[PDB]
Amino acid sequence: EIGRTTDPVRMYMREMGTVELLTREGEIDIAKRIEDGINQVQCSVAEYPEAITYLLEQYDRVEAEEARLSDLITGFVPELAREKFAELRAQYVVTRDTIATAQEEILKLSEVFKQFRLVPKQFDYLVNSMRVMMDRVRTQERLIMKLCVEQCKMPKKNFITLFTGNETSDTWFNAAIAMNKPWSEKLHDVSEEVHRALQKLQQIEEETGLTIEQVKDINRRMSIGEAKARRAKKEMVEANLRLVISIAKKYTNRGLQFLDLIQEGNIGLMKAVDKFEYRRGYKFSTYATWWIRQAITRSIADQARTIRIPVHMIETINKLNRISRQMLQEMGREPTPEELAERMLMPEDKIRKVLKIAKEPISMETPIGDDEDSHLGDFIEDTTLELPLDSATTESLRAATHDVLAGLTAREAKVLRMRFGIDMNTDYTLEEVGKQFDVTRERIRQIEAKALRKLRHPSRSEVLRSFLDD
Amino acid sequence: EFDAIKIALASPDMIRSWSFGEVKKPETINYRTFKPERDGLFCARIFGPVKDYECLCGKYKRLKHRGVICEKCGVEVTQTKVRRERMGHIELASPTAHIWFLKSLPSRIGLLLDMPLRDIERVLYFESYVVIEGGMTNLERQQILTEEQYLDALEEFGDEFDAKMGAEAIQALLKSMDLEQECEQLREELNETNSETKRKKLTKRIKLLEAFVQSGNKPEWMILTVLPVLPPDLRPLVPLDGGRFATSDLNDLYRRVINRNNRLKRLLDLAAPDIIVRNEKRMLQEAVDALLDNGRRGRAITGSNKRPLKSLADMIKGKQGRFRQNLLGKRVDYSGRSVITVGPYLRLHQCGLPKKMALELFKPFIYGKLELRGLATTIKAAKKMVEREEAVVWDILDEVIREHPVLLNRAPTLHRLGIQAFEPVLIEGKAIQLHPLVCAAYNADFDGDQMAVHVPLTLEAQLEARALMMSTNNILSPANGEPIIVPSQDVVLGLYYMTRDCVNAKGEGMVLTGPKEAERLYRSGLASLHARVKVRITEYEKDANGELVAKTSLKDTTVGRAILWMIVPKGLPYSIVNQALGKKAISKMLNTCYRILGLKPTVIFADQIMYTGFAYAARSGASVGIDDMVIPEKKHEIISEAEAEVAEIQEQFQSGLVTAGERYNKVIDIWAAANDRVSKAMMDNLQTETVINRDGQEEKQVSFNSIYMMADSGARGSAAQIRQLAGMRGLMAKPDGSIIETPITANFREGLNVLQYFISTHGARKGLADTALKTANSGYLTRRLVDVAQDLVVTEDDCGTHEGIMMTPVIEGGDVKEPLRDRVLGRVTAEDVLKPGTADILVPRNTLLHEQWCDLLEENSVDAVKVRSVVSCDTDFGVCAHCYGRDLARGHIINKGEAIGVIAAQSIGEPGTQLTSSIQVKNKGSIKLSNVKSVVNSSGKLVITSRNTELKLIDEFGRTKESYKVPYGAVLAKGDGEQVAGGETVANWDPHTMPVITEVSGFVRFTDMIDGQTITRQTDELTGLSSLVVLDSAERTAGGKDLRPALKIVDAQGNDVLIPGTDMPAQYFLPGKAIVQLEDGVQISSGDTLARIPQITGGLPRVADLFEARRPKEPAILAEISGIVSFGKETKGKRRLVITPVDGSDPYEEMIPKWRQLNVFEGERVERGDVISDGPEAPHDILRLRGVHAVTRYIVNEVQDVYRLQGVKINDKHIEVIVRQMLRKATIVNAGSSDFLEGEQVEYSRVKIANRELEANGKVGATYSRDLLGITKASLATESFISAASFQETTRVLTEAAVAGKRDELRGLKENVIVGRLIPAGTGYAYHQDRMRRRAA
Ligand SMILES: [Mg+2]
Ligand SMILES: [Zn+2]
Ligand SMILES: [Zn+2]
């Protein structure tokens, strides 16, 4: 039963039905697990001082007329906020000035930070800064192990014993070389790179202000918390796929595919899971339905037409259609667009424009009866082409104007050709022409006027006069 | 600018290099001012500007800023025509397989990866896992695991095990595959293993992989990563008149694809669950598959409302595709159409043309003439004058149309004569006049038919139309060498009335000094039109060497014939106008005058004949009246006798003496006899009904009836029509197919009743349906025949060959249906002819046999002349003129360059709508036998013991007049060379049971049979004869199956009887159901009976099957090689056919069915290609066993017989050309020294030239066997993929081409038409030769 089908709907239904829906107790348990993981991640990220440093820097930037208070803290768990930030700054400075009390004061600072409701973007910035620093530390560590374990070929267990804990000194530097083995004394050339890696680690440690093992502990603790939260969210999504499908059932004939609708519903369900709260006592379905229907409707308004229409205009069109239907049902027959202005609040032209908005375009390959098996696309002609009669008239006019310009004097022909875009890429202004010819602008104008008068004189340009078709 | 086209598959890098940008949004327009949106399907910055040299933002709107890109929007300032050739690309987020290479008829990817298509589709559907690089995990490189199995394997091992799913896994496997290692492994397997199916599969795999390696393609490129975007203009979004829009389905498909890709990217960014990611990947795969080819993989996606969407493959394919609807045929300018009329005053080389149509057509010519004459200063002034229609534009038109031909064409173009050229004559009206003589050629009438008009434009086209397509230049049919402009109805009637003597008339027996005074006496009213008079005439004869000799004498003729003698050209005898001059006589006279004088006298004589016939028909004024249908006075009596006989037969049936079937047969026979009697009586009464008396008692002559003359001049009507008009119309046919026992006894002159009318309606509707379907079938057949032989062009003059085809007259066992003159005229002789008596040398070898040579051969009574043919031509890529012979449309020989294949196909396909025991000698002759093993029996009759004996009747001229097949063991009265008389029985036999007589005498004894085991004891109830019926294998038991009844003739000494001339015993193993005539203990004699063993579609589906090479349903078994037969042991079957040669081995064996009768005996020696069974013969076996001559002779004979039965005359040159084209491919047996495979199928010309080169060098050639293919198979198997893709299976042809990386040289007619240049057939042959000679100089 693994195959014998082609439609992906059946396979999706099978994969979805392989799992079973939850109950209220399971929802409460999953919410509790999510809260526990979030609290663990919050503690792990508050236990670091660089979070407080970034908080103080952002607060200083806000106070320096460079940002706003809206994206600083998402409420509280505004003079009170200012005094709390001042207290946090004082706690941080006394923590930096109390380098055996540093650990306890860091714990107190972390508790006060957790007492503050920051912004998710700020929390993500703290998380990615932690990731950057731990990635630098682990890159240095892998360079350290590659420089002697994979280069000096020094023993595994010996490396583990003399490297677990120190990670800073020459315990892995001189021992791997001066241990009287035939393959040990051959990499004083890479000893320099070993020293450079040690200096890089020392600089990173000085910048961080803490050890390395505690950093690794925080990193893997928050990784475990994130994995637990992801597992719980995946369980919730797999449980509520059925509700997503049930909600998406009712929009299957609005220009969008059922699979697209259910995918948008899944996205909305994930968004709702990301913000669900179980302390209110309400069931998850009531909170998820709003998000799912909002996502489905937004997708329908966005990507269900060949020509995109804004959400507000789509809502206006829907409201107009609903009114019109209600008035038709109540009164008896189709009303007039002028009468809709009395019922609604419109200047009587917006309704006309909405009605004049073009519907979905007609298919090019639609047939018209038999018509010797011909479609609509066989009766559309290109309007951008120029007639051969027009091209021949243009060629004749060019020849005639060239012949007429040959008769005039050389200077007159040159100044004419310069004034008008004739036989050249572009025309030249009267001032540039005068400058090129070393002749004043007014004299150029007078010579042009004399030429025009001579051309207006009769017994010439008879074909030019004949070039008018009126 | 180019000479070849290369096709392959596109790499992602090349696709990116094609693209001018990336498309990221599906937005089309902004619904306000309809401006092109950014990064959309119609993005201006990607696909170029919208207007000419106009920026999108307006900053630059002049040609001065051409070539510079804007900074506000980025839109280059250039022409708007670059929007028609600019393409975009889309960066897919996940790999997507190509639907063509996956769902093509052969699964390219499946058989490349040695994986089943079902399994590959399973992996693609995200159903099961697949292992890649298993390593030391005890897992195969292509093993498929389910979800549970994959989880179990991951639990045990977390490393050294890689498993993926879908297009990514397929691409990884394709990349990891090693082509060279696969090739060497498959070659080693081919060398080691020995199996037919395995060898075939490995050979196909090795060929495909070697071609892939030779080509520059890569296996991983079959999975799409970046896909191209069609240019905007090819999928327009133009605003329709009324504020609406029109769009193509490609826009919606691209929109879908883009939206699903964006959703997949968003879900990947948001770390979506695995199930959702898989669902999105599946949606993307489905969207791409539906964009590429909708409806191929699953159900087709519906469009806007109801209809399904159209894809790129849909546009490429179909009858309405680009290849057929917009590239092979195209609408053209300078064309016009209207209704046609007669206009009898016209000449053969001119037609009538309305003034308005010619004024509308020759507008540029009029404009140029007006400009040149100085009447109009400007082209606009000339156009205004033409619109105003002044008095000078008509003169200008008369000047320009004086010598400018035109083209007239009818909408069905069945043959070459569907388009002709004429010389326009300006007339008043809106209807075209067409010459009556070309009406038969055009197959047009005057009941609302229409025709098209085409104006040649260039000088070369005008000269071609004048020199080749002119009506006077083609008077002979290309199909047969006969005239095609012969009069049909009115002229034939007029000439028949003119030349028809009478018994008594005015001025009988007057002596006339000339046709001039004969016409005087006619016009003056002093003599009748047709009276027997004496006229002095002078005739001229070309007996001299090109000179004419005049002789004068007195002849007995009529006034009409004397008057008609004026228009006869001065090259013909007077005897050709001294008859009734029907339609056949008129055609023969026209042909004789042509062949004797030339061309100009022929057309002049035809015009004069038509004028005279029209005039004299109008002068006679024959009519039709109700009294013309003469009812015989015996019809009622015959009807009464028939009714009495029917009543008597009914009473006899009621008495129980006869059965229902016999009663029906008797009734229908009586009715048919009555109908024949009535028809004969009415013929006799109508044919000589006119009786008069001249200067005496009485005399009888041919009847003067109007209908009789109409039916006897061949103009209209026939014997069937006359029978239906003046007599009963006979028996009808029920819808089931049988014949109603009650005929229609009323004719059309009397009143038919409702029952008979309702009965006739069935036949009328059947006829109408058959006519409706025949055209639809003939069109397809003609297209299939044209597309297979379109590349055949005469290219050489003499190939220097010595082979030929033996040509003999067709004899069916009676009167000859095809004289030897018809099958030999116009052909070149392959070998020098000898004298009939074999005494002197006759006409030389390389002569062209014209009418003089044919007359000489007839006079000398030559039996059979052999001639060359195109199937034996040695010319490579074409044929020579000598082998073809002569074009049977002009007097001279065939010219070089003519595309004979198109003419042959058209001639074959044109008449397709016309298609729906005792020997009794006829005439005295000498009995002749060929290949007869005869012997004298005990009764004196010449019994025959050979199955290949033909009875022939040779007269004293030495010509063959009869041909009969003599069954084996038939009684013959006469012998060889014995003179006989007509109507004498010479041969007798029993068709219901063939004899098992022996050629030797002696004793018959019973050995190796047991009563009940093999034979049964039965006593006849009536005759009482005691005979032993031999039971077959199924009737007998299993024990006696190995003991066949063996009867052997023994002499009086007990030894086996030796056949005279040999010593092999003659024992016969009787098969089942063999009744033995004589028992043991009774001496027999040679030629005595010993044992007895009991023993066509209409229309042209026979022609279709013959041209398609379809195998018969029950083919006749033939002998592979000559030798003795050694029956095989039943092996779950009837018998095993093993033929032992004289000295060679006998490994051959055949599976003979038990329900098929066999003819060969136990000790009968068979010959190569000899028949073993009875039934239809297979053309492939015929070819394989008797060369190409036998099979081409069989095909030609069959098609000629069908066409002759249908009444259509077609020359066999076309058939021969089609057979040659069908006999183009050939396979390889074994390669001597040139690289070739053991089963590869290549062109015959290639291996021929390779073998010639090897023989010229010091190497050894190879061996091949000719192959026979159908027309469609030959057309599909073509070196050029363009022609194959144009015909059928476009997707398959393109896939194979792409995969193989084939290079296409034009080298043809259809490819040059597709590309749009001169074809190398007509005037462009010399241009093509010059181009070839310039290239590679
Ligand atoms: Mg007609
Ligand atoms: Zn711009
Ligand atoms: Zn030849």
TrEMBL record, chain A:
Mg(2+) binds at residues 462, 465. The keyword Transcription applies. A motif (Interaction with polymerase core subunit RpoC) lies at residues 260-263. The keyword Nucleotide-binding does not apply. SUPFAM superfamilies: Sigma2 domain of RNA polymerase sigma factors (SSF88946), Sigma3 and sigma4 domains of RNA polymerase sigma factors (SSF88659). Residues 236-306 are annotated as: Sigma-70 factor domain-2. Keywords: Cytoplasm, DNA-binding, Metal-binding, Sigma factor, Transcription, Transcription regulation. GO terms for molecular function: DNA binding; metal ion binding; sigma factor activity. PROSITE patterns: SIGMA70_1, SIGMA70_2. Pfam families: Sigma70_ner, Sigma70_r1_1, Sigma70_r1_2, Sigma70_r2, Sigma70_r3, Sigma70_r4. It comes from the Bacteria. Coiled coil: none annotated. Residues 430-449 bind DNA. GO terms for cellular component: cytoplasm. Residues 315-391 are annotated as: Sigma-70 factor domain-3. Sigma factors are initiation factors that promote the attachment of RNA polymerase to specific initiation sites and are then released. This sigma factor is the primary sigma factor during exponential growth. NCBIfam families: PRK05658.1, RpoD_Cterm, sigma70-ECF. Belongs to the sigma-70 factor family. RpoD/SigA subfamily. Interacts transiently with the RNA polymerase catalytic core. This is RNA polymerase sigma factor RpoD. It comes from Escherichia coli.
